[PDB]
Amino acid sequence: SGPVPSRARVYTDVNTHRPREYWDYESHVVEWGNQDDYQLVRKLGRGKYSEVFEAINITNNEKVVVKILKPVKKKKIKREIKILENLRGGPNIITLADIVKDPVSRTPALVFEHVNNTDFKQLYQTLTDYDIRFYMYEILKALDYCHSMGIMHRDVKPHNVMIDHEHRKLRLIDWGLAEFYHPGQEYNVRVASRYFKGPELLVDYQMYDYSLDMWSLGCMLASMIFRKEPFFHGHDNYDQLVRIAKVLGTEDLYDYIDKYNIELDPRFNDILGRHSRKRWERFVHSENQHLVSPEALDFLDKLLRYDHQSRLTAREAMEHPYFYTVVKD
Ligand SMILES: O=C(O)[C@@H]1O[C@@H](O[C@H]2[C@H](O)[C@@H](NS(=O)(=O)O)[C@@H](O[C@H]3[C@H](O)[C@@H](OS(=O)(=O)O)[C@H](O[C@H]4[C@H](O)[C@@H](NS(=O)(=O)O)[C@@H](O[C@H]5[C@H](O)[C@@H](OS(=O)(=O)O)[C@H](O)O[C@H]5C(=O)O)O[C@@H]4COS(=O)(=O)O)O[C@H]3C(=O)O)O[C@@H]2COS(=O)(=O)O)[C@H](OS(=O)(=O)O)[C@@H](O)[C@@H]1O
Ligand SMILES: O=C(O)c1cccnc1
């Protein structure tokens, strides 16, 4: 009767072995810093849930970024704080330096280590082959770390990667959609940005895991090596699945639906069509061919798979031959 369950194949039980305090973010007691330490310099942007400012720590003259959380569903604030505290110090994870109560909004303001207000979307269509491999490896360090800590990011996309290209440093940011992975839990499918949403989300399969982030990463990789922004260019969440099926084929999609006993939304019957998988060479052309190698195509092929259980994990991805040419350390 209805969809059958799924588990992560790695890091399945990390939260079950933790003290309740690790993952029970609703019970977390925020420790507050001194709002007087920070002076706002200029507004950088405004999300659905926050406003972000360049700021200065007056106590040491060091630049920081301040993210003032909007009203929001209040539970989501403690979730982001606890995740950021749990991950602090991990490889390529943005560092939460402080949490203060903003005097004007009267809401929490997260103070982050300074990063150059340059996100990966500004650079990722201009990198050399070597730099694509280098920065993909850096992103994978962050994803394996958070997955190993029981956390899925759920919003991997170029705007959530901050890059200091002069210093060859990268940080994975915006943990406001991240969640703790609990085996057998059903999650909200209204996560990730349209072009980066995994098939599990698009077919309304709720028992997903860390492997969602590996699909999103694959969408970023495909966009970079093929110079196609985005790779899967859906006009809405339904057409998004059709765009995927035009590349990966409908037979493997129906096999995925069949395996997890998913009831596909009947609105797909008139739009999905019948498609065969395309060989990845179809996307290679004179402008992108210097970014494509057998290793890049084999790696991408193992990320962009309908069945979330079949995708490479972050650690398996770091083992791939695509990264043999990247200098380690
Ligand atoms: O100039 C640019 O830089 C732009 O870059 C790319 O767009 C990025 C946005 O700039 C960025 N905005 S943010 O202010 O920095 O955060 C961010 O967009 C996300 C925002 O939340 C929002 O974008 S907005 O322009 O600020 O309005 C938009 O949110 C969508 C949700 O994704 C969508 N969720 S769903 O799962 O598809 O259903 C839905 O939310 C509705 C839903 O019912 C409920 O939300 S929930 O959280 O899923 O539960 C809730 O009820 O709210 C609903 C709602 O608000 O409508 O729709 C909203 C609204 O979207 S829309 O109607 O304006 O289309 O998209 C978010 C997102 O992550 O996409 O990030 C994007 C992407 O960054 S990137 O992938 O790195 O590029 C764009 O460039 S490109 O994508 O064309 O290549 C472009 O907009 C621009 O070029
Ligand atoms: O995590 C965030 O939302 C963030 C972190 C650093 C810079 N800007 C945003």
mmCIF file of C-alpha atoms and ligand atoms in Angstrom, residues 52 65 67 80 84 94 112-113 115 162 173-175, ligand 2:
data_model
loop_
_atom_site.group_PDB
_atom_site.id
_atom_site.type_symbol
_atom_site.label_atom_id
_atom_site.label_comp_id
_atom_site.label_asym_id
_atom_site.label_seq_id
_atom_site.Cartn_x
_atom_site.Cartn_y
_atom_site.Cartn_z
ATOM 1 C CA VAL A 52 22.314 40.043 4.970
ATOM 2 C CA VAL A 65 28.699 39.195 7.658
ATOM 3 C CA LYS A 67 22.354 37.712 8.691
ATOM 4 C CA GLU A 80 19.829 26.766 11.463
ATOM 5 C CA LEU A 84 25.759 25.813 12.238
ATOM 6 C CA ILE A 94 30.932 28.783 6.910
ATOM 7 C CA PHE A 112 29.572 34.850 10.212
ATOM 8 C CA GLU A 113 33.296 34.903 9.536
ATOM 9 C CA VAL A 115 33.735 35.936 3.174
ATOM 10 C CA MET A 162 31.054 31.551 -1.620
ATOM 11 C CA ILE A 173 26.747 28.788 3.115
ATOM 12 C CA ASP A 174 23.018 29.234 3.858
ATOM 13 C CA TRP A 175 22.125 26.348 6.093
HETATM 14 O O1 LIG B 2 24.871 31.425 5.646
HETATM 15 C C1 LIG B 2 24.492 32.455 5.068
HETATM 16 O O2 LIG B 2 23.291 32.666 4.836
HETATM 17 C C2 LIG B 2 25.578 33.430 4.632
HETATM 18 C C3 LIG B 2 26.875 33.237 5.098
HETATM 19 C C4 LIG B 2 27.890 34.099 4.682
HETATM 20 C C5 LIG B 2 27.554 35.128 3.815
HETATM 21 N N1 LIG B 2 26.296 35.301 3.408
HETATM 22 C C6 LIG B 2 25.300 34.488 3.779
#
